[PDB]
Amino acid sequence: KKISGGSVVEMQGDEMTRIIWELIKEKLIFPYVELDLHSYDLGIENRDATNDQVTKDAAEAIKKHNVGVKCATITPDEKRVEEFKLKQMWKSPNGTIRNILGGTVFREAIICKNIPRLVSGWVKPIIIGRHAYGDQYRATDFVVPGPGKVEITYTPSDGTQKVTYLVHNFEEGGGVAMGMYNQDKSIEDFAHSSFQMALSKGWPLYLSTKNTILKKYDGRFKDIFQEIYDKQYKSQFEAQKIWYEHRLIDDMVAQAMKSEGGFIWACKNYDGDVQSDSVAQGYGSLGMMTSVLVCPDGKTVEAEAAHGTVTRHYRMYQKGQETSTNPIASIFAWTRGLAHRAKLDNNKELAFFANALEEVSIETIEAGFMTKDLAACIKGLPNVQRSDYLNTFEFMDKLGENLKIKLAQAKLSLEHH
Amino acid sequence: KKISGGSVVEMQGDEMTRIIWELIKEKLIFPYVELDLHSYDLGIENRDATNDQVTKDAAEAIKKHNVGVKCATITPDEKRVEEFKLKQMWKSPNGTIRNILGGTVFREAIICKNIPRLVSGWVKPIIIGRHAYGDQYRATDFVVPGPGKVEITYTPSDGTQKVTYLVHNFEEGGGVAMGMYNQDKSIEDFAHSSFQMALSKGWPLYLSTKNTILKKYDGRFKDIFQEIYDKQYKSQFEAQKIWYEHRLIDDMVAQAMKSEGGFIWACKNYDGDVQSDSVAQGYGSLGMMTSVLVCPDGKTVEAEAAHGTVTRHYRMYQKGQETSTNPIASIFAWTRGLAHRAKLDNNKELAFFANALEEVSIETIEAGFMTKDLAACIKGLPNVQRSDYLNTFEFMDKLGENLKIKLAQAKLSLEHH
Numbered sequence: 001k002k003i004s005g006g007s008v009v010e011m012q013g014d015e016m017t018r019i020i021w022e023l024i025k026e027k028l029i030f031p032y033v034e035l036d037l038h039s040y041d042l043g044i045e046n047r048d049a050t051n052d053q054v055t056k057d058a059a060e061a062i063k064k065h066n067v068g069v070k071c072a073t074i075t076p077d078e079k080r081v082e083e084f085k086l087k088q089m090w091k092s093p094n095g096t097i098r099n100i101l102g103g104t105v106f107r108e109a110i111i112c113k114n115i116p117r118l119v120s121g122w123v124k125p126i127i128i129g130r131h132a133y134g135d136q137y138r139a140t141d142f143v144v145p146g147p148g149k150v151e152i153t154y155t156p157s158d159g160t161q162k163v164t165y166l167v168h169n170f171e172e173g174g175g176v177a178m179g180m181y182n183q184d185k186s187i188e189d190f191a192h193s194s195f196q197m198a199l200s201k202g203w204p205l206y207l208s209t210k211n212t213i214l215k216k217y218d219g220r221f222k223d224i225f226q227e228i229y230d231k232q233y234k235s236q237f238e239a240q241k242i243w244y245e246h247r248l249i250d251d252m253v254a255q256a257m258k259s260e261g262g263f264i265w266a267c268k269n270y271d272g273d274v275q276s277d278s279v280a281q282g283y284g285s286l287g288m289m290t291s292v293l294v295c296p297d298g299k300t301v302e303a304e305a306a307h308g309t310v311t312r313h314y315r316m317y318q319k320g321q322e323t324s325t326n327p328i329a330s331i332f333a334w335t336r337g338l339a340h341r342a343k344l345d346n347n348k349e350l351a352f353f354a355n356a357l358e359e360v361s362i363e364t365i366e367a368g369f370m371t372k373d374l375a376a377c378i379k380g381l382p383n384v385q386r387s388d389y390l391n392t393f394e395f396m397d398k399l400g401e402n403l404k405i406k407l408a409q410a411k412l413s414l415e416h417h
Numbered sequence: 418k419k420i421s422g423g424s425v426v427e428m429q430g431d432e433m434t435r436i437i438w439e440l441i442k443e444k445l446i447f448p449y450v451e452l453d454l455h456s457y458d459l460g461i462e463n464r465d466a467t468n469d470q471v472t473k474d475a476a477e478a479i480k481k482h483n484v485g486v487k488c489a490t491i492t493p494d495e496k497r498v499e500e501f502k503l504k505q506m507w508k509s510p511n512g513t514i515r516n517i518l519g520g521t522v523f524r525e526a527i528i529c530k531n532i533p534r535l536v537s538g539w540v541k542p543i544i545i546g547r548h549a550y551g552d553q554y555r556a557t558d559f560v561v562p563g564p565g566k567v568e569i570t571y572t573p574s575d576g577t578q579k580v581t582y583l584v585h586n587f588e589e590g591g592g593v594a595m596g597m598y599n600q601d602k603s604i605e606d607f608a609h610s611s612f613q614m615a616l617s618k619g620w621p622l623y624l625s626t627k628n629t630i631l632k633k634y635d636g637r638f639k640d641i642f643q644e645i646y647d648k649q650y651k652s653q654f655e656a657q658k659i660w661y662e663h664r665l666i667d668d669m670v671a672q673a674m675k676s677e678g679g680f681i682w683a684c685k686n687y688d689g690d691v692q693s694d695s696v697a698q699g700y701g702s703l704g705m706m707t708s709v710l711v712c713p714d715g716k717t718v719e720a721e722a723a724h725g726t727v728t729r730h731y732r733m734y735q736k737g738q739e740t741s742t743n744p745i746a747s748i749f750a751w752t753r754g755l756a757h758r759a760k761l762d763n764n765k766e767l768a769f770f771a772n773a774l775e776e777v778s779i780e781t782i783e784a785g786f787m788t789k790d791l792a793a794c795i796k797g798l799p800n801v802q803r804s805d806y807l808n809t810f811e812f813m814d815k816l817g818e819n820l821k822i823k824l825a826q827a828k829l830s831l832e833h834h
């Protein structure tokens with residue numbers, strides 16, 4: 001008998017990750033879980049065919065069903081526009097989804113005992129809470145073709161005043177300019193999510209900004225966090241012998257590098273992007289990271305594989321050549337989404353399944369069965385031999401076999417007791 | 418006999434670094450070198466007294482004399498305004514100087530064989546070329562008090578057109594907004610400095626941007642670098658078997674973490690700030706880093722101690738307590754400035770002196786004589802005993818003694834040959 005999984009929004013993606021996504025569903029999910037799956041194809045060709053409407057439709061479906069699982073997608077540049085003959089250079093679908101849902105993206109390494117860290121001191125996890133809204137991801141940027149003034153203005157909705165600031169008077173030649181923004185309510189939601197994560201883990205929290213330079217913009221994040229801490233969380237932190245402190249971003253990246261881990265790090269949108277990749281690589285592998293958007297309603301989540309679409313492997317796959325691609329981040333997008341679905345529905349069987357699949361994934365790699373990219377972490381890519389790893393299909397089949405075993409034994413444990 | 422040093426602009430700074438700066442001049446520079454020193458006091462109290470004009474005057478003096486050496490300064494926040502009863506919350510003096518001079522700030526770790534790295538793979542140096550102009554450091558940021566529209570506009574100097582872009586329509590509540598810019602000529606100068614640094618070292622060059630998100634703003638940096646590479650440097654790189662490649666910033670920080678070092682990394686202003694601190698800490702210590710602004714004229718430099726003013730030690734010093742503060746980055750600001758002064762003046766004696774003082778500094782620490790902060794790198798701060806390190810004065814005297822020896826022996830080597 002299969003587990004009744006409930007409603008899940010899935011977003012199909014691109015290139016190698018698109019192939020792996022289908023293998024995960026076929027081999028690891030569908031044989032055990034029956035889902036009311038709302039499928040949106042976010043492949044670059046379908047986003048082009050729908051003028052990117054499919055991306056907005058998927059985000060609206062997540063608001064409705066409360067759980068989304070997303071495959072890695074291409075954010076097209078000039079080369080991609082030429083490759084696919086795109087109508088427009090479509091904006092990041094992750095940016096589109098995040099700006100519709102809002103919230104905080106929590107990112108953490110997926111640790112295997114036999115995969116070495118690059119930062120030896122990191123014995124405890126570092127969890128980044130990346131503010132998912134605004135800043136560079138909803139900016140208006142443009143080329144300044146020549147001499148002239150760039151100004152930024154604010155006009156209150158009543159129409160009773162107008163403030164105009166000179167950004168720059170280009171006196172000789174041109175350049176570039178941009179405007180960006182953030183919202184008080186979004187920053188407040190980011191603060192609440194960060195304080196709640198720290199209390200859930202029993203770890204201290206650090207917020208990074210550059211408020212000495214962006215005195216008003218970054219000063220606002222610092223002020224909102226401090227006001228919310230003082231009024232709503234300080235006694236809770238004190239009860240757990242933890243603390244909250246603001247840090248300048250450049251001091252914070254050095255503090256993190258020198259640390260033993262074991263803290264929550266609240267990052268603005270851009271820093272969360274950069275620093276989560278630095279941290280994932282520091283723990284051993286860029287591809288071994290979870291990424292879950294927690295929305296402000298405290299009910300909606302979107303789990304994703306945050307890494308690239310592995311174009312190099314896709315080109316090999318297109319030529320009918322053997323590939324060996326790490327599917328773990330894509331599997332954990334499904335297990336994190338299904339664990340939330342289970343929490344919302346009080347579904348014990350689904351919660352057990354989601355945790356079991358995470359355990360199987362880690363146990364498989366720790367038993368020495370892994371893809372080429374993971375074998376390269378241990379030995380170095382030029383030293384990897386074909387006898388050191390499993391191809392994509394072989395690895396998925398090994399996970400499938402280990403999953404069947406874990407679930408079979410647990411089923412037998414019930415009937416006995 | 419003393420070395421005729423020539424003209425140097427010095428900028429005095431704040432707190433503990435201000436005390437160390439005077440010790441360096443008194444013990445290591447003035448007994449050996451006679452300088453035409455143009456002194457500017459950039460202490461927070463003097464910047465307040467002159468309404469920050471001293472900072473602009475110092476930058477103009479560097480343009481005139483071509484060499485500046487700068488002590489670490491305070492960039493005041495709300496707490497500093499209260500502490501010193503400041504007239505205004507003065508902007509970063511580093512930002513003011515850099516935006517007047519322009520150029521690229523080259524940053525690299527100062528390596529000691531007995532100071533352990535936190536990233537074991539980094540066996541070769543990583544040099545960051547941080548674009549010194551514009552972006553967040555010359556931004557216009559403000560609080561949005563409530564609902565209303567933020568717009569950004571461009572008006573060419575002829576007055577024949579006006580382009581207006583909506584940044585955001587705040588429908589409920591307020592937030593923050595900002596405008597920033599960069600200049601084509603400054604980006605071109607940054608590109609030239611980066612390509613020239615890579616060729617000087619015989620190492621590949623990487624530029625990081627987020628052009629998939631800021632398609633026009635970051636796309637411009639990517640385009641200018643590629644055009645300059647193709648037209649002016651590609652054959653030179655090919656002759657040295659090196660290369661230039663653009664990378665997305667989040668991919669680049671992971672690539673750097675996983676690397677063995679040995680490359681030049683061109684960073685936009687904000688990334689150069691953050692990533693140079695991450696890299697300095699990765700090599701072993703935040704305080705062990707050189708930082709030299711190379712201006713576009715190919716004649717002017719400003720060397721600085723890029724770390725903080727060590728307020729914790731200054732508070733101990735104010736209470737008449739013993740302190741042990743690492744002066745190495747402040748010494749290397751002087752040696753890097755004096756080495757450039759020597760290059761401009763074809764002054765062999767000064768060039769020898771600047772290199773000798775760098776050698777003495779590293780040899781002293783490698784012989785096991787160091788400050789508490791460096792002893793903490795080896796043993797861990799809670800494990801450091803007073804028998805493991807020298808106080809500030811003791812360390813400066815040890816450096817002074819070793820410098821006297823190095824210079825005495827070299828003087829004797831001439832007279833013999």
Ligand SMILES: *[C@H]1[C@H](C#N)C(=O)[C@@H](C)[C@@H]2CCc3cnc(Nc4ccccc4)nc3[C@@]12C
Nearest residue numbers: 286287307310312313323324325326372373
């Ligand atoms: C994987 C590949 C195989 N099989 C190779 O033979 C190399 C050519 C190839 C280099 C580029 C590359 C990039 N990324 C991955 N794996 C990965 C990274 C991040 C997330 C998931 C997977 N693997 C490769 C290989 C090593």
Ligand SMILES: *[C@H]1[C@H](C#N)C(=O)[C@@H](C)[C@@H]2CCc3cnc(Nc4ccccc4)nc3[C@@]12C
Nearest residue numbers: 703704724727729730740741742743789790
């Ligand atoms: C230095 C100090 C001494 N002596 C102590 O006893 C500690 C209280 C103090 C903690 C804070 C601190 C910060 N920075 C430094 N050194 C430094 C850093 C960067 C550049 C130059 C110097 N040292 C301390 C000590 C360890």
Ligand SMILES: [Ca+2]
Nearest residue numbers: 273274277667
């Ligand atoms: Ca990323």
Ligand SMILES: [Ca+2]
Nearest residue numbers: 250690691694
């Ligand atoms: Ca810095």
